[PDB]
Design a binder for this molecule. Sequence first.
Ligand SMILES: [Cl-]
Ligand SMILES: [Cl-]
Ligand SMILES: [Zn+2]
Ligand SMILES: [Zn+2]
Lengths: 21, 21, 21, 21, 21, 21, 29, 30, 29, 30, 29, 30
Amino acid sequence: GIVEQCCTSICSLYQLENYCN
Amino acid sequence: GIVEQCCTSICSLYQLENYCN
Amino acid sequence: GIVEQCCTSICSLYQLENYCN
Amino acid sequence: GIVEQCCTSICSLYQLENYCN
Amino acid sequence: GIVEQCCTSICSLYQLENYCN
Amino acid sequence: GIVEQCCTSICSLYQLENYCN
Amino acid sequence: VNQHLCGSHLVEALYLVCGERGFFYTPKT
Amino acid sequence: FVNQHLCGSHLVEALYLVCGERGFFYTPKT
Amino acid sequence: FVNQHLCGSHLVEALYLVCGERGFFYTPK
Amino acid sequence: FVNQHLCGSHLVEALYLVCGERGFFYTPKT
Amino acid sequence: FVNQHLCGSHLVEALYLVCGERGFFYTPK
Amino acid sequence: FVNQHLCGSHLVEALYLVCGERGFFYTPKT
Ligand SMILES: [Cl-]
Ligand SMILES: [Cl-]
Ligand SMILES: [Zn+2]
Ligand SMILES: [Zn+2]
């Protein structure tokens, strides 16, 4: 999930958008 | 300014990108 | 919702806890 | 103090409240 | 107090240093 | 740059001021 | 803009209050 | 882990910005 | 609107930066 | 004006995220 | 890396949230 | 690279405060 993905590599705003509702 | 544009109404991410290098 | 409930007057920690999963 | 107590293991808001006036 | 002093007109760094220990 | 100077070790206010316009 | 600024602080507060539980943020009325 | 705690604080700020009106669930254990 | 609360959040951050190792005191009074 | 001061803080954070490796100038005056 | 400084910034935010009308001191050490 | 990403967020907030009406230039580049 988001922590595994984005706390070990920088997520772009597009990658973050994947987690929106 | 960015202030007059974006502190008086909400700027989209795309509008903000105008102030990037 | 939370903006109506918590941006006009300050929400307590108990009120904020309403939004926890 | 608070840095030693709370900067490697996460302090709860209860543990943190101890540092309040 | 800091809220009266600094929440309408902007406090400088020097003004803010008044509230250091 | 600022990331090399100021993320490796803490920059003072004065050092940060170097990067102002 | 006021609601936008408030919401940023709300999410930070929810993050701390809720911890491991996580939270649901929606601006939906 | 405090490092992960600090990262997540920034994640949810970024989600707030990106998601806009959609909002988001933050589910750190997923 | 929660403006004093929001202001205080930013004030504490500013004090943290300005005051360094000394630390600071915050009172909303 | 403190209201603008607070807003600008959030603006800079948003520019930081949007602009990525590009970085940005923040120049109030305009 | 400035991790302790970054931790303290978030600690003060958390104290701001949890503490009440008498406020708090931040004294890292 | 996340450590530097998180640090940079705090750096920009600090520059915002320190630089006042001058503003600042944030580059991550070396
Ligand atoms: Cl951080
Ligand atoms: Cl604000
Ligand atoms: Zn704010
Ligand atoms: Zn941080």
